Design a protein around this ligand. Structure first.
Ligand code: UPF
Ligand SMILES: OC[C@@H]1C[C@H](O)[C@@H](O)[C@H](O[C@H]2[C@H](O)[C@@H](O)[C@H](O)O[C@@H]2CO)O1
Ligand code: MN
Length: 278
């Protein structure tokens, strides 16, 4: 399967740990990593590659110009501009009709095959519902969404890349931002929801288990489909630490955070400069 990550130099060490969690969870599947590289040093790219399977033979770094998204809002402090690179995925990857995009702050705990094998049809992508945003009464509607269209989290996305390449996603994004820039609160995540609403395949929350999913253990909707997708079917396949509290920081009380340090300690090569953040 083809996995996509996006990272700047600041997140190179975390990218490595996340990538290894993917390999660990798929002992008999070829994992081809495609990294949207917003400025990772040569040393950090070699370090990341050195810690992956085959010495990093299955990882390709794709240079992206962070300035491309300079005009887009950047209000969330823990997030850098690289968070918008995913919008040009159709321009960055030519060899894949389907890719599975993951944020850096994820820890894969179970096989992603069921998600990967999902047929997207003519939908733009497959994603899990964001309970945090869905319970933010009235927000969804601020960005033009209907009550029956569920707001998804942009941290785990099965992308119908073949469909994306038939359109100019960046232009559509810039136009959407121009229309909603004064109300959007979630940056790239708002854009994706706004552009693809009505053309989203919903995956079970086991593939994007965030703090709110954990706390959830009253549904915002009675819709049986909504309930089916938001009820996580155990075991958790993907832990996603969205928000300012990350597993690589101090006193992370988020569930499953200890697997991060456990993976970091299993790293083959750890540069002196990674000792701090890991
Ligand atoms: O120093 C940084 C900070 C962020 N990033 C990138 O930006 C993504 C953006 O942020 P988080 O994963 O920390 O975002 P968060 O999960 O808290 O936020 C929700 O809203 C975000 C909005 O911009 C993203 O869409 C994200 O996918 C979604 F889950 C990271 O995965 C990473 O690829 C870097 O490369 N370096
Ligand atoms: O859609 C989730 C949303 C994305 C946003 O970018 C991120 O900063 C944010 O964090 C939440 C987190 O999901 C909650 O569990 C926590 O209680 O609050 C933070 C906001 O400070 O999540
Ligand atoms: Mn995230």
């Amino acid at each position: 399967m083809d996995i996509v990550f996006a990272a700047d130099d600041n997140y190179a060490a975390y990218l490595c740990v996340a990538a290894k969690s993917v390999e660990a969870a798929h002992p008999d599947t070829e994992i081809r990593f495609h990294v949207l590289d917003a400025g990772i040093s040569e040393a950090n790219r070699a370090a990341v590659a050195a810690n992956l399977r085959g010495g990093g033979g299955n990882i390709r770094f794709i240079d992206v110009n962070p300035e491309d998204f300079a005009g887009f809002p950047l209000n969330i402090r823990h997030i850098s501009i690289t968070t918008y690179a995913r919008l040009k995925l159709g321009e960055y990857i030519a060899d894949c009709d389907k890719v599975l995009y993951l944020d850096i702050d994820v820890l894969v705990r179970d096989s992603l095959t069921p998600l990967w094998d999902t047929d997207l049809g003519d939908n733009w992508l497959g994603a899990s519902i964001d309970l945090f945003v869905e319970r933010q009464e009235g927000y969804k509607q601020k960005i033009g969404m209907a009550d029956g269209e569920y707001y998804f989290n942009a941290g785990v996305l099965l992308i119908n890349l073949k469909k994306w390449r038939r359109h100019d996603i960046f232009k559509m994004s810039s136009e959407w931002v121009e229309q909603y820039k004064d109300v959007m609160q979630y940056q790239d995540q708002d854009i994706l929801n706004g552009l693809f609403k009505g053309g989203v395949c919903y995956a079970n929350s086991r593939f994007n288990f965030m703090p709110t999913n954990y706390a959830f253990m009253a549904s915002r909707h009675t819709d049986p489909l909504y309930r089916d997708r938001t009820n996580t079917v155990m075991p958790v396949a993907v832990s996603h630490y969205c928000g300012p509290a990350k597993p690589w920081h101090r006193d992370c009380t988020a569930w499953g955070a200890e697997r991060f340090t456990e993976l970091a300690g299993s790293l083959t090569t750890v540069p002196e400069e990674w000792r701090g953040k890991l």
